[model samples]
Target chain A: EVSEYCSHMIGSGHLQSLQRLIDSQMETSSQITFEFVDQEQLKDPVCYLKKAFLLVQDIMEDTMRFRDNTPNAIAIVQLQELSLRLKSCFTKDYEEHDKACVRTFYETPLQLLEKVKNVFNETKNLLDKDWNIFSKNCNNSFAECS
Target chain B: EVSEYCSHMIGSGHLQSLQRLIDSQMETSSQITFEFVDQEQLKDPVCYLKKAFLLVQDIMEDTMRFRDNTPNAIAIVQLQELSLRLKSCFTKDYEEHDKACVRTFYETPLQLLEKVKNVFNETKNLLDKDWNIFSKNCNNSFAECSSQG
Candidate 1:
């Protein structure tokens, strides 16, 4: 068994980092407004994923800090991959919608909105895995953990 | 082997975090004054370890973020233990000095000053080892890091 001391030290530290990342994301989404149709619906999921992006990005940025470790290294890959996909989701939302607005401003197309929703759900599932890794590892006893 | 891309990504991230922590400490020591002789000498090493303290404390504060990881976890223990020792060094420096001062303020005792210097060196050595874990791990090549699927 690990000392209660390590448990307290390690566990609480990660908690605050994630909390800080999410809080910052939430604050960012609250203020941003983009011109376009279906802006409200798109904003909600995009903001949610934006928070996830920040958290994953923050974690992945440490690449070599945990370079020697296994789980963290893999997490960096997975989270980064997700980050790219999320970016694509937004880019497509903007571009595809832009094409329709060529003649005049077009409402967010139904198909494009559907793609955003699907990606949002997929991204959320991946986010859940990342969260599990962070949580389960934190919960593990020191003996089992590091 | 892990791609160079991942190597660059993970390694630099840790470096920045530690760098930020030390920068914050340097800023803190810039202000605030406390009374006592040898304050100048003590400030040098104390601020040095104070820099170390801030770095470790920042790493530790992230909690579960590194909890699952073993090496980083051990790094936390060692760093935290050192923090307690550093605090003790200061406490002893103060309490022991007060005893010698029987009167009002006096110059820092030579022997006490030496002891402080010795501990500072010892602590710095230990800090270097801790720093190596961060530095060396951050410096490794991607081919050596993770394998691509």
Candidate 2:
């Protein structure tokens, strides 16, 4: 059922449209600069992950402002669903780690957009493989999954 | 000396160009929405002021990203100067007030733009009157100057 759903979503071009939206957002985001006072703090995986999560969350919230626009509705829904799934992967342990992370270590909005794109692609691949793999690998280390 | 500098800035159209940049930013900001969990909290002047300050600070930081572009350089400098002046008005007392203020109370980006416009205009008028008037009224309540009434 998961594979069938993923195939239909991909085949129907919903994911493609969402990808286009993400690409456009990345272009816009690239124009803005994100400040980082400390370069080395971004080395921690937990800090990096938290920054990525927050940036995507900011973009998703911004997307909600246009929810009423009919042309963007399909892509918005697809993005929202993906955002929720990505959000669930952040466990309480990650939250505690993030709390201790310094605020200066963060990704630019463009990096976050790329992260979102990769997550969508990876999750699609995992769905295609098997739902059990997705369930088992849904933790923070899911990105390392084959 | 301050009045002379301001008059030159205003007369040379630097302030006008900066005003145009602010207007353009306001238009762009209006397209985005700000989230607020509580409605009544914005009624507090300190909270509202903090939100407005933060919003303008965000815009100013964003403006910095384009500082290398020659065409925007004049307006950019003018904005940076005005931003520093505004920053001075936010004293330690306001900082403490802001700390106690709920995070949920915030102006939309558009509202912050409006506040920035008003500050520029009011400061311009104060300068036109006299530098002493500006120095005397340079606090957060400077907006309540005679021109505003």
Candidate 3:
């Protein structure tokens, strides 16, 4: 489901102008509605303007849905970009999300998360800061940016 | 010398302003006074300023003093503040430097400290990034900030 959303919106902004250009260039026949342009070259002066960032931004937003409970769109958006900006927040990219980036985000979120945890701990003895904690590890990549 | 430096600049940057306000309105003074503001009532305001952070900053800076380095006070001060800033940066009383504020700071400083491992690593193999696989784990925190800006 997450992957599907990314595919739909991926490069949609960049391709908008291209779609118009292609619409004028190609025909209304019965086929793949695709036309060709120099894929390597950018025709519009505004190409790549915010396209890369926007796409990564979307990916990051979906990625963050795992952590925050009060996850505001703007806050998530800021976090997503900050994660992308850091690119390599972990000690190593392949280390482990639970151990690294999420661990970094642990500074503030843990306190909030513990309250969330205790609610479950008392009523049912159930426990899990797991998924959100894992996601926190990922966001810690943005820690120094903190 | 280190103690002297600490005693002089101890409460200057972040602590001084808040400490001063408390000064005019305070009832008495101690040889070394400390404030106790409620986290909940004062909105966790007084709980934020930590003298330990200043002490920790000095620890990191002192390490760099021996390594072919001269005085670069402003840069080092901000670097340490940034290190501690990572603690309460996103907090409600985000300006305050509380202990809970340090989890991220702990890892980051060590991580950056690892970068300097290279300088001493030549003689003290533990500090050398060139020899280790986890090299980027460390970086010159000072250089990293200025260049990034």
Candidate 4:
């Protein structure tokens, strides 16, 4: 019962929509950059990547408010499902690295923006890989389960 | 030399501007509320507060981009100074509490908004207390330091 119900939500159409949304958001992140700061902090990729993830995570969380009203709710659900997978993929590493990686004290606005872009690209690559695996095998697994 | 340069930036006017900025931002936070979802996660204030601080901190960091272009640069610098003080104030507690407090998985958007508001009010109260203390004695300390110099 549960497997069928969950499998029903994993259609290619929904996956495509999720990919498009993720791509557009990643594009937006790519265009943003930091300026006017020559500080040592800006040079640290780990810190900036952490900041970027927070910003993206915050935005995705915000979009959930429209989950019911929007036509993209199915895609949103799929995106959330993918997000969970992504979380579990990195949870162990995060446990050890999160504290050292997320330090922010006197970061300037532009630097934050630049860091967000860098992290978004890194995340996008990871997501793309997972997305491909899910896309290729999800239907076969669901078919076998049914 | 750096102390005097930093101290000169901490005038009452700049402090007042920073307070006003903070108050307005907090007002924005207070008015926001989550409408849907009755999940168990929404009940967690620590998680919500952590979210709120991130939202607020992100905005403050963004405001720094305009520091040189706007007239509010002095106040912005002061705000950054105060922010550093606030960071130091809670660093010990954060070291212990941050990981436990910042867990978020499937939280709805409304839940996030509500958490942000709750944390904003909590933070506002703390900032109010700190602001009063700073307002009371900063001038005197700066005066004495200059006299000693």
**Residue B70 lDDT (model 1):** 35
Pick the lDDT winner: 2
Tell me which of candidates 1 and 2 scores higher on DockQ. Answer: 2
Query: Which model scores highest in TM-score?
Result: 2
Better of 2 and 4 by TM-score: 2
- Which candidate number has the best DockQ? 2
DockQ category of candidate 2: incorrect
* C-alpha lDDT of residue B58 in model 3: 44
Candidate 4 lDDT over A32-133, as tens digits, reads: 122221224334333343334444455345522223533344555555565454443332223333233233333322333334344445555544444322
Tens-digit lDDT track for model 4 on B36-149?
Answer: 212233333333333344444553454222324333445555556655645433322233222232222343222343343444455555444443322221222222221110
Categorize the docking of model 4: incorrect
Instruction: Return the TM-score for each candidate structure.
Output: 0.26, 0.31, 0.18, 0.24
Off by over 4 Å in 2: A1-12, A22-58, A62-67, A82-111, A137-146, B1-149
Query: What fraction of native interface contacts does model 2 preserve?
Result: 0.00
Q: What does candidate 2's lDDT look like per residue over A1-146, in tens digits?
A: 12344322323264566544443321122232332212244443443443445454555565233334433445656677765655444333334233233333244444544555654565555545643333232234322222
Candidate 2 has which clashing residue pairs, if any?
none
Summarize candidate 3's per-residue lDDT along B6-49 as a digit string, tens digits: 22222234333222222211111112112221223212211222
| CA lDDT scores, all candidates in order | 0.30, 0.42, 0.26, 0.35
Q: What is the interface RMSD of each candidate, in Å?
A: 15.6, 10.0, 31.4, 13.9
Misplaced by over 4 Å in model 4 are: A1-146, B1-55, B67-69, B91-121, B124-149
